[PDB]
Amino acid sequence: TLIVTTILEEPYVMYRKSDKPLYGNDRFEGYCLDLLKELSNILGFLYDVKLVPDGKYGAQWNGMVKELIDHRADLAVAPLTITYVREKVIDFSKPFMTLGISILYRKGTPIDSADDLAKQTKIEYGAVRDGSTMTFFKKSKISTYEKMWAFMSSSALVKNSDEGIQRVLTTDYALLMESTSIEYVTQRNCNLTQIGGLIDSKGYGVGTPIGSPYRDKITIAILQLQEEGKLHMMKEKWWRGNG
Amino acid sequence: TLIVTTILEEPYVMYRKSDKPLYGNDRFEGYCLDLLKELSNILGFLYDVKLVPDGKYGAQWNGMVKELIDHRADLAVAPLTITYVREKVIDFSKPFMTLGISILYRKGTPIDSADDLAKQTKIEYGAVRDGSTMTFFKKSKISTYEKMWAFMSSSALVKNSDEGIQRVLTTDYALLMESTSIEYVTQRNCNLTQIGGLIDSKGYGVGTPIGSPYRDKITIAILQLQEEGKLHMMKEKWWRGNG
Numbered sequence: 001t002l003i004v005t006t007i008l009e010e011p012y013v014m015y016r017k018s019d020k021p022l023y024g025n026d027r028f029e030g031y032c033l034d035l036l037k038e039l040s041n042i043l044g045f046l047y048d049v050k051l052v053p054d055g056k057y058g059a060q061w062n063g064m065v066k067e068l069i070d071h072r073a074d075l076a077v078a079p080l081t082i083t084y085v086r087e088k089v090i091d092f093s094k095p096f097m098t099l100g101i102s103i104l105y106r107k108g109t110p111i112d113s114a115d116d117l118a119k120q121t122k123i124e125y126g127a128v129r130d131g132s133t134m135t136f137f138k139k140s141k142i143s144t145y146e147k148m149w150a151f152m153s154s155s156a157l158v159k160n161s162d163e164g165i166q167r168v169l170t171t172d173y174a175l176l177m178e179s180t181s182i183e184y185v186t187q188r189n190c191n192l193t194q195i196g197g198l199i200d201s202k203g204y205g206v207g208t209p210i211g212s213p214y215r216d217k218i219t220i221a222i223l224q225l226q227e228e229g230k231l232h233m234m235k236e237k238w239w240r241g242n243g
Numbered sequence: 244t245l246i247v248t249t250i251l252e253e254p255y256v257m258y259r260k261s262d263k264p265l266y267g268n269d270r271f272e273g274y275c276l277d278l279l280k281e282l283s284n285i286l287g288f289l290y291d292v293k294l295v296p297d298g299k300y301g302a303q304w305n306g307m308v309k310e311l312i313d314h315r316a317d318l319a320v321a322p323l324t325i326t327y328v329r330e331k332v333i334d335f336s337k338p339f340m341t342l343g344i345s346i347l348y349r350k351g352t353p354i355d356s357a358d359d360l361a362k363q364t365k366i367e368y369g370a371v372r373d374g375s376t377m378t379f380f381k382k383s384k385i386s387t388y389e390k391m392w393a394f395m396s397s398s399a400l401v402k403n404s405d406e407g408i409q410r411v412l413t414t415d416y417a418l419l420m421e422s423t424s425i426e427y428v429t430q431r432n433c434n435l436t437q438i439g440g441l442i443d444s445k446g447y448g449v450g451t452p453i454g455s456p457y458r459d460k461i462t463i464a465i466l467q468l469q470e471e472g473k474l475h476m477m478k479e480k481w482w483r484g485n486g
């Protein structure tokens with residue numbers, strides 16, 4: 001009965017491996033599908049997974065945020081960052097995942113933090129042109145990140161994350177991006193590693209239209225899953241690589 | 244006009260240094276006071292800081308949670324963990340700090356993770372008897388923590404965190420406790436260090452009575468502070484030691 005809007009994004013939402021046509025919600029698998037099953041089991045509801053038409057997360061509105069605003073979806077279950085501008089138009093459950101910006105670089109170097117990159121110019125580094133990561137640096141008033149923005153600002157920016165990862169693999173370049181993706185990539189490419197910890201902090205939350213009768217029910221369920229260790233189990237399940 | 248309940252806890256809420264009697268809200272200083280000033284400035288409200296009588300956070304209810312439940316306080320601004328049982332009786336803003344259980348141990352050893360402690364018995368380790376940390380281990384079904392509970396369960400538990408810290412300093416003992424305290428202690432005692440990362444995940448939120456007209460206003464303000472980098476600035480301000 002509940003319409004869930006989401007977006008194809010590895011390993012949150014992916015098509016089950018198969019060479020034949022797949023039907024229904026079961027054609028999808030991933031972290032967010034497992035989370036949805038857990039939520040539906042706790043709250044006791046049926047659901048219909050729909051892919052947001054424009055394939056966008058939500059900016060101003062479009063994407064999943066718009067689907068919720070227009071009430072075409074009851075929930076948005078995806079790695080949707082809880083932000084100031086979004087929280088004003090939709091509601092978010094408490095975070096089912098906490099993350100932040102971090103660094104993707106090749107293993108085997110003495111570089112161990114953002115500071116190490118900030119105090120040199122041999123190694124180039126940047127982020128996806130005009131993304132929230134680039135904006136973070138442009139607006140930061142913190143010493144380390146101001147220096148980094150000055151460097152980035154002075155060809156160090158990339159078209160998208162995929163190109164950024166290739167840049168890291170084919171040149172002496174460090175990429176700044178969402179940490180969850182960095183963990184996913186490093187678990188699959190032993191030549192790459194995360195440099196330092198989280199540069200900023202944010203979380204992913206399940207989205208609902210403002211005033212939804214499921215808002216608090218979902219937060220409670222998430223806290224239950226968090227405390228039972230199920231969110232940790234799910235993260236490990238979909239992120240762990242072959243070592 | 245707004246009554247804020249809180250609790251003396253270094254460095255969240257402390258008495259300003261002085262040898263003469265201090266009056267009003269200004270007799271207090273700390274991370275939570277700075278957060279309160281920021282919130283009051285954004286939402287535009289006046290406040291009266293009161294110390295919760297029983298000096299408890301909130302368990303079943305007593306402490307700050309009870310003050311909110313009985314509507315004797317409009318807000319609870321303190322390092323109050325957002326939990327399943329508490330969220331059912333009061334409301335929490337989105338987290339202004341994210342943390343978890345971690346390890347406090349002496350520097351200079353090859354121990355680098357919970358796994359390292361779990362696979363040995365020479366070094367004793369434990370937590371505060373009957374606390375949420377001990378309960379975490381007792382209920383965990385994760386290999387590493389089950390092994391640790393078996394060890395702890397088989398004098399490794401302490402009366403309180405202070406005794407635990409002394410145990411770490413005077414004997415070959417590792418203490419499991421809230422990471423925020425570990426960061427505070429290690430910043431002040433160069434002989435101690437945090438072992439590994441976070442074992443579980445949780446956050447601190449501002450508490451309000453269920454159905455408060457400030458609930459969403461505070462979450463929005465927190466996201467604003469988070470995105471502007473003010474929460475990071477405040478954390479650094481009150482946690483940084485003399486190196």
Ligand SMILES: CC(C)(C)c1onc(OCP(=O)(O)O)c1C[C@H](N)C(=O)O
Pocket residue numbers: 009057058079080081082128130131132133178180181
């Ligand atoms: C979900 C995934 C981890 C793949 C992700 O990686 N980078 C992102 O955004 C960067 P920007 O804000 O620059 O578009 C997002 C999406 C983001 N969590 C959102 O809610 O829009």
Ligand SMILES: CC(C)(C)c1onc(OCP(=O)(O)O)c1C[C@H](N)C(=O)O
Pocket residue numbers: 252300301322323324325371373374375376421423424
């Ligand atoms: C605030 C501080 C960081 C000092 C803290 O350190 N250990 C704690 O609890 C351990 P237990 O749950 O075992 O009492 C708390 C208090 C906790 N955040 C709460 O909300 O009760």
